[PDB]
Please model this.
Amino acid sequence: NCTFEYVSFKNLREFVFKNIDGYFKIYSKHTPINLVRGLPQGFSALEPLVDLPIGINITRFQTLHISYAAYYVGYLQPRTFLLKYNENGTITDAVDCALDPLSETK
Amino acid sequence: AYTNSFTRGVYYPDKVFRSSVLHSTQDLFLPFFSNVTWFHAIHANPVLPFNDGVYFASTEKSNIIRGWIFGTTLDSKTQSLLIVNNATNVVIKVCEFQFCNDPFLGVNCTFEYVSFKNLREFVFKNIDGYFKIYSKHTPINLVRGLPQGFSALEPLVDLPIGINITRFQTLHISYAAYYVGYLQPRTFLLKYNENGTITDAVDCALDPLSETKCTLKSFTVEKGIYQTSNFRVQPTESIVRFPNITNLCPFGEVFNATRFASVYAWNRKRISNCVADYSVLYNSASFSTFKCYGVSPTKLNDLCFTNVYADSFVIRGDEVRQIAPGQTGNIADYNYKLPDDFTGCVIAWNSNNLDSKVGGNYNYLYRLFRKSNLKPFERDILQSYGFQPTYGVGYQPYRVVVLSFELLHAPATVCGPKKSTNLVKNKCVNFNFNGLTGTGVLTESNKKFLPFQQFGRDIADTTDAVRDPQTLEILDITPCSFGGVSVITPGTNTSNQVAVLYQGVNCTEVNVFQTR
Amino acid sequence: DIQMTQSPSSVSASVGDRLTITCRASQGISSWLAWYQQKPGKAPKLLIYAASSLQSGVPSRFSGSGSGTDFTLTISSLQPEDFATYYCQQANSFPWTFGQGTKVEIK
Amino acid sequence: EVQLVQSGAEVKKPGASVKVSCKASGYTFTGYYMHWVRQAPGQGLEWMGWINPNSGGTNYAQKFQGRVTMTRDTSITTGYMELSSLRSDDTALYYCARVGAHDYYDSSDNWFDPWGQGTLVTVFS
Ligand SMILES: *[C@@H]1O[C@H](CO)[C@@H](O[C@@H]2O[C@H](CO)[C@@H](O)[C@H](O)[C@H]2NC(C)=O)[C@H](O)[C@H]1NC(C)=O
Ligand SMILES: *[C@@H]1O[C@H](CO)[C@@H](O[C@@H]2O[C@H](CO)[C@@H](O)[C@H](O)[C@H]2NC(C)=O)[C@H](O)[C@H]1NC(C)=O
Ligand SMILES: *[C@@H]1O[C@H](CO)[C@@H](O)[C@H](O)[C@H]1NC(C)=O
Ligand SMILES: *[C@@H]1O[C@H](CO)[C@@H](O)[C@H](O)[C@H]1NC(C)=O
Ligand SMILES: *[C@@H]1O[C@H](CO)[C@@H](O)[C@H](O)[C@H]1NC(C)=O
Ligand SMILES: *[C@@H]1O[C@H](CO)[C@@H](O)[C@H](O)[C@H]1NC(C)=O
Ligand SMILES: *[C@@H]1O[C@H](CO)[C@@H](O)[C@H](O)[C@H]1NC(C)=O
Ligand SMILES: *[C@@H]1O[C@H](CO)[C@@H](O)[C@H](O)[C@H]1NC(C)=O
Ligand SMILES: *[C@@H]1O[C@H](CO)[C@@H](O)[C@H](O)[C@H]1NC(C)=O
Ligand SMILES: *[C@@H]1O[C@H](CO)[C@@H](O)[C@H](O)[C@H]1NC(C)=O
Ligand SMILES: *[C@@H]1O[C@H](CO)[C@@H](O)[C@H](O)[C@H]1NC(C)=O
Model:
């Protein structure tokens, strides 16, 4: 009962998965890193790649490991952000308008 | 023949007394200096259009013109206004008169009334069924043409006839030239003297000087520069853009399927995540039955749906009529049932060449008995059809495709591919890029959009540029030239010559001097 | 229902005459019209269908024309055996309905 | 030969019923509708209804609804028209006629062809 099918540390692969009015929006950014212990510190914006109009109520998820890789899970909140667009239209910085009074001032 | 209307054709717009005042009013007036057709009555009484109102004038020396006829056919089939003035008796009738092939005077009626040296001007207009007649009589001494000057026409008669008047003809006395003009929704500035008589007028669209006079509500303009009207370039054509081939939908493998299923075991194909091109139903005239319910096929390529279901099966001609909401029979009740609120289209064509064998094709079956009727869109999985080439049209096989459209509270992935047009650069156009519309000039740009970015915006959040969905180039959107029109003039006590400044524009879209 | 009005109700013509019979529908029926011939003591017989198509075996002096609301049965060269009553019939919509018939007599 | 042969003329009392038969031969019986058309003294023709001999479905003119019944017996390729509660103006020539289909006007199959010879029903005491 399939309704859709598509077929096409050194590497950090970040993703955002959100469902707005039935649309499953996937964002990602790949960048080389040289760090095993934890997430590298820095800023990098994730571009959209895929938008699947599935309309599915998603409440849980699980990862898939290749067995013969740490991963992190965060949650989104309705925060206001100030996004800095450079001359090429790439987001290079951001201010979380509720992190602290200085960010609120900015 | 044509003559100069000069300043004729001004009438009192209403019944209000005014004095020592310049009053600006918008009504159907004869444009100043317009051309009016010149007819002769020497040694010529055609039927003229009425349009939105007619200005009429004549010059007389022996009272040759004695009446007018207004109507549509002038042949006793409809009501036609007839006005006749014979010696001292003015006669007005609206009977369904039977007129001659060429009406003239020799030397079911709903209304009746009975009462060169002379210029008699008239205005005839119909507003909401009221036929309004204005006129002014004045002595003249001129045979060649209309005298030059200004004279306002007072109202005399208002007949609430409610008759649609589109043509008129004049009446000549045979043992007198006349002019026909047309009214336009122009704005006029009317000068009322101390006695309430209109003595002059300004046509607020004759020229920039008249626009200035109207702006200041005066017949005298002091030396200086005045802003009278905003200039705005209009678009010439629309531009509709959609990708050339985003993603098509496999409607071919549903209609052109090598083999079909029986009606009791009808096959369902799910259409999702693809642009639905319905032009294969429009172009392909090989369809026998094409009926839609709840939606129209023309307004289908511009409408989104959450999902589309394509049901396909085979029945005979007598059963094709059963594939519809509110139908009964073996097929509707036991094989394939459509709900009463079905929203879709039913397509069928004669497949006798494919689904018939010389020994009878018995591979297509149908359910004959069932303890209850099927629910809408139910598939229950028997009698065999067995079609022959010599079968009657009602018993020949037919391949049916039933497209059903659903719209739920979910994202719609199936919408439709609308035809694209050519793109015109460096011209004011009304553009549509992936559903985003607007007006502006499309030019080449050097903006490096990222592969995921489709539209650009400026500080004001307006659209700055778009990426053409067919050719991955960035086009700048510059709103079409606009500004203001200023009139530079010395006072009217010196000269009526003016200069016009078009503010913040190039001398392109408009003795021309380009300034900053 | 769709009313079919035939004219004339009767016509007398000579052998060899060209004869025209008209049928007017109360609304548009495209080409959904037929013409039948009923000879004395016999059942009607299809002559023309789809306004202008000749039924197999029918003499080609019987022809039809028209579309929409106005239809014409033509007999190009009248024969004595054409003494009969002729009926138009619409099949655009049920109930299928007939004209009142045109009686053809021979001088 | 394709032919429709009807039963013989009958007299029936007012209020009674009549059942006319139409035996088909020379064609695929279940492959064509059978229609009934009647012709009253003023030789007008009046469509009565049809039976689909394949499905058994029927459709009657509103004038005869509740009073006419059309049936068939496929095993003997015969159709029947029964008209009940007969009245004086039911005196008429009753015809059966073959019709191939009710969709495409462009085919000769889809018109009345052929007709039976008619059955005269006289309603009188
Ligand atoms: C996805 O979740 C929404 C919301 O929880 C569901 O919407 C509910 O639908 C039922 C009947 O369809 C209603 O009685 C509820 O009131 C709806 N919820 C709200 C909050 O209004 C939706 O049906 C779910 N989809 C699926 C496939 O389970
Ligand atoms: C005079 O003209 C008007 C407008 O052409 C006619 O109004 C039309 O009336 C019919 C039915 O009465 C409507 O179907 C049309 O839509 C109307 N037109 C418009 C533009 O709305 C009016 O009937 C005409 N009067 C006479 C006597 O012919
Ligand atoms: C298939 O999934 C859809 C979800 O949209 C559901 O409505 C349908 O009933 C399912 N069919 C079967 C046979 O599970
Ligand atoms: C934008 O891209 C160009 C090359 O396409 C690069 O030279 C330039 O430095 C980039 N801009 C920034 C702010 O890095
Ligand atoms: C009216 O006709 C005159 C010559 O008869 C011409 O000079 C004038 O330009 C015409 N008016 C317009 C608006 O073209
Ligand atoms: C003028 O015309 C009217 C209308 O036809 C006619 O009745 C009348 O006799 C004519 N003559 C006079 C002197 O009124
Ligand atoms: C008379 O004219 C009126 C127009 O208002 C029309 O309605 C009416 O039917 C006409 N009567 C006759 C007998 O022509
Ligand atoms: C107004 O009418 C009077 C006479 O009634 C006349 O003397 C006066 O000059 C008129 N006004 C103008 C501006 O002509
Ligand atoms: C759409 O048009 C572009 C521009 O020519 C072309 O390169 C591309 O291949 C087209 N799309 C398809 C599916 O061919
Ligand atoms: C016209 O009016 C202007 C007022 O700006 C004045 O300076 C000028 O001298 C006047 N000229 C005449 C001829 O009255
Ligand atoms: C006006 O247009 C000309 C050519 O059409 C161009 O050379 C000039 O720079 C333009 N001026 C402005 C102010 O846009």
Summary: The two ends of chain A are 51 Å apart (CA to CA).
